[PDB]
Amino acid sequence: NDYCQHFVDTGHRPQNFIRDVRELIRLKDELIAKSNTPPMYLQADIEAFDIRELTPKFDVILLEPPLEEYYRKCWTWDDIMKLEIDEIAAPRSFIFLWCGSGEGLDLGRVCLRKWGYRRCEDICWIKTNKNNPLDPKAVFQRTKEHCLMGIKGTVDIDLIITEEPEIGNIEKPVEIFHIIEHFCLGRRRLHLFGRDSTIRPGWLTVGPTLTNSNYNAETYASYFSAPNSYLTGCTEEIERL
Template identity: 80%
Template sequence: MNSRLQEIRERQKLRRELLAQQLGAESADSIGAVLNSKDEQKEIEETRETCRASFDASAPGAKRKCQGEGEDPEEDVEDQKDEVEQQQAEDSGPYEVVYKDSSTFLKGTQSLNPHNDYCQHFVDTGHRPQNFIRDVGLADRFEEYPKLRELIRLKDELIAATNTPPMYLQADPESFDLRELKCKFDVILLEPPLEEYYRESGIIANEKFWTWDDIMKLEIEEISALRSFVFLWCGSGEGLDLGRMCLRKWGFRRCEDICWIKTNKNNPGKTKTLDPKAVFQRTKEHCLMGIKGTVRRSTDGDFIHANMDIDLIITDEPEIGNIEKPVEIFHIIEHFCLGRRRLHLFGRDSTIRPGWLTVGPTLTNSNFNAEAYSSHFNPPNSHLSGCTEEIERLRPKSPPPKTKADWGGARPGAGAGPRPGAGTGAANATGPVSAATGAGSGAGGAHTGGSPLAREKVPEKTCSC
């Protein structure tokens, strides 16, 4: 408890220091001197109005000149009249407050303007609006949700215990036949070096970049299992449409879009975007998720655990020229899909990890053996990681699908004709069938068997989420 309290205090101290830096305060303790309360703001406005009114009252008398100085009285009166009219015209206009920076608009400043203009703050300081999103890391995301935090911990332990040893193969997917892997994969992650990455940064590529025509030629459909998922990083431009075409060609249906929001806390400033077609600065990338086969959240709990993570990744943008993707994408995939056969195409030495087969042209070594890799999934081992009772109890679940009886619809033959002990309801019966009497409850049908009031209420199916 003491360590938890100490951690909260340290985070509060860091936030106050950041706010003091943004507001121009000398230290975190002097923020109160910079910020004004509502009463103080009201007092300031009243003082301004008083000064303005006193100035208006004293302006004509202050500008009078002594007539004993040899000046023409009529000319003097005309000058005074012109000055008074000019002053009145200036005072009659609306009072405009000039803002020199965006500190007035930031959250927590109790300013006269209630808006949090983080876009203006980006223009002033270079800090992107997403820099101010709190608790974005894996360790802090579920800090206030103990149930989900415990679930993630249990899932990580199970994944670590069921992962296969890391395997990697130095091969160029353009010339390598993927069928030589001799395996059908549950999850395939593609991270192609797109031309878009190098075009925006203006740096010459140290490896061959791939066009979307080259990516579409990959025979992903030959190495994907009957029910499987593919995750394709497609940038933030034309890849959103061309990536969908790739999924369709491989036999997948797009079902999700994971968005990587890039922050610049460590390097605030404006991104040097060199793409001639860009109007705005791009600070995000997309990872398209495709599904193959029939997989339902409510019935296929042995293969997927839905709603374990969010579809956003918020991390700091890497340096210019670095096209590596955040490691959090691996956690999202492992938490979601229970399949243990995972393939990472276009991987690098830095992305080799347990539970994955990494294939890429820039790898410096290889240890892949098709027979040894397949042996990890032979009986009694399974290609699924399995689940524990505690994980099943904690994980979010979808309600099971309701049958027609649950919705009040008639089953085939219910109330359609005479049966032993059954009523002779109309063929378009819409009510439930009584389990106690077998009587149809069709509207308008004559009842001949059992009590018409004897109906058993169908209990609703529930599940613990």
């Protein structure tokens, strides 16, 4: 059965026919939940904001710039590439960059290298169209988005499959947070261009559309002061008193 031919025949994307898409992961999810910091968040216009005010340096950065391709204030790859992400990333740290499906797959890699990362995974968000069976440069209908994982310094699969969201819904699948958190990469987690709707325990969310803020740099740093400076986010809290 050729699902490419089938898509040509019917309009049902081949990913509509992927099926089913040890346990133990539930305990790990529970440890993550126990060690998570309180959600912290800050309304900031990132184009005018000195991101060096965001301290301390982060173990994980999730970067979700609002690309114009998402709509059919937008950020171009010119804008994104000029963010000084290297100035707030910890010497050993990770980045997850939503790159879209067009020139971002190239320019996002330039960004990763510019900020000092090397790409170690390419996570594809594959969009089904079970419910509703073109870029001038495009050769094919684009039915997926890429989130690039980068590393600097010294149970999941690289696919997320959900239905294509309604028009104008720009949210990314919350499953990306699950993948990131299951890596147990450390506890200082920054989500740039997040929204009220993406605020989450264990994350600092910074973005222009946030309606409220609670970020205080000293309070935030106090979550990671000794004896908690090196926890992975997947281990029990350290007994106080």
